[PDB]
């Protein structure tokens, strides 16, 4: 549940930063299709005028505490291996890869 709480923090932190939709890129491509002399926008899609935003300071720190929550999930069950229904070997690789 700690990984879920930090997940909801990560999802809203990207929503506050926000992205631009760029639904008109096919039609700016059609304008450059005939005005510019370049053969480039023929076989290529016209890219973004400005790219996506950056992972911020505390927004990266929230990724680090999500890593700490998932790894402590891995190793609390590793030091409590007395119960066999604690992080089956398929999930042993799975939570360890995507935490780090």
């Amino acid at each position: 549940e700690c990984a879920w709480v930090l997940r909801s923090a990560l999802t809203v932190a990207a929503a506050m930063i926000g992205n631009r939709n760029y639904t008109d890129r096919n039609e700016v491509r059609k304008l450059l299709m005939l005005t510019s002399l370049s053969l480039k926008p023929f076989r290529q899609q016209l890219e973004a005028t400005t790219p996506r935003q950056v992972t911020n300071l505390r927004m990266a720190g929230l990724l680090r505490l999500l890593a700490r929550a998932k790894l402590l999930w891995l190793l609390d069950l590793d030091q409590k291996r007395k119960c066999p229904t604690f992080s089956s070997p398929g999930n042993r690789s799975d939570v360890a890869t995507e935490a780090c």
Binding site: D24, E27, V28, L31, L32, T35, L46, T49
Partner: peptide, 12 residues
């Protein structure tokens, strides 16, 4: 709208 937008792309 495309006339100014392609000038924004060229400005980029």
């Amino acid at each position: 709208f495309l006339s100014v937008q392609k000038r924004i792309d060229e400005a980029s």
